Nucleic acid binder design. Structure first.
Ligand SMILES: [Mn+2]
Ligand SMILES: [Mn+2]
Ligand SMILES: [Mn+2]
Ligand SMILES: [Zn+2]
Length: 198
RNA sequence: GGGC
RNA sequence: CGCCC
């Protein structure tokens, strides 16, 4: 399934930092059956899961990049295969996950056999959900560098990040953005994999 | 319209 | 309106 026992032990220990009962956001970039960026966020603790995956459909990816995420495909080369399945399978049983537009999130969780996970859809408008878009990027821009491509709507807009979306959707529901220290759940060497002769 |  | 619900 991708991961050695040593890595599985590290992952399951890291995911115990998630409070099984706390408010948990989840957003993805890319199609549900072919995701390229996955993020979970718990505002109560400041814990976040954030990782990437290589697209199977390159033609769909390049098209999605111009209208949504703006991820350069070259930057996804060092990603760990099987991370998506391993993280989702390690999520607490009957966990309650909140997000904007639950349809794609549901299809991804169901494709991983996690029908037990309950989903709350906030179902806000694009304007209401992204009221604190500027404020989130102003505070947390250093947490993701992957969105370098120009994203259009014809008007240039801020690229869609799975992690930034989780934070800004929370700020919209709470009616404000808190100054809080964020903590990465996954080790950096687990997200990304490189020598020397050939 | 919502998601990408 | 590129795709998708
Ligand atoms: Mn989404
Ligand atoms: Mn998004
Ligand atoms: Mn629309
Ligand atoms: Zn990102």
């Amino acid at each position: 399934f991708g991961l050695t026992y040593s890595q599985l032990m590290t992952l399951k220990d890291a995911m115990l930092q998630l409070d099984p009962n706390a408010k948990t956001w989840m957003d993805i970039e890319g199609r549900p059956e072919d995701p390229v960026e996955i993020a979970l966020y718990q505002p109560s603790s400041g814990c976040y899961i954030h990782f990437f995956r290589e697209p199977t459909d390159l033609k769909q990816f390049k098209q999605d990049a111009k209208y949504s995420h703006g991820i350069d495909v070259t930057d996804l080369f060092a990603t760990q295969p099987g991370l998506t399945s391993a993280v989702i399978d390690a999520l607490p049983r009957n966990m309650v996950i909140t997000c904007q537009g639950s349809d794609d999130i549901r299809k991804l969780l169901e494709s991983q056999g996690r029908k037990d996970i309950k989903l709350i859809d906030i179902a806000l408008s694009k304007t209401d959900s992204r009221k604190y878009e500027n404020a989130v990027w102003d505070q947390y821009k250093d947490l993701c560098h992957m969105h370098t491509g120009v994203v259009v709507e014809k008007e240039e807009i801020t690229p869609h990040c799975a992690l930034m979306d989780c934070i800004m959707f929370d700020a919209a529901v709470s009616g404000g953005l808190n100054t809080s220290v964020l903590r990465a759940v996954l080790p950096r060497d687990m997200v990304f994999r490189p020598r020397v002769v050939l």
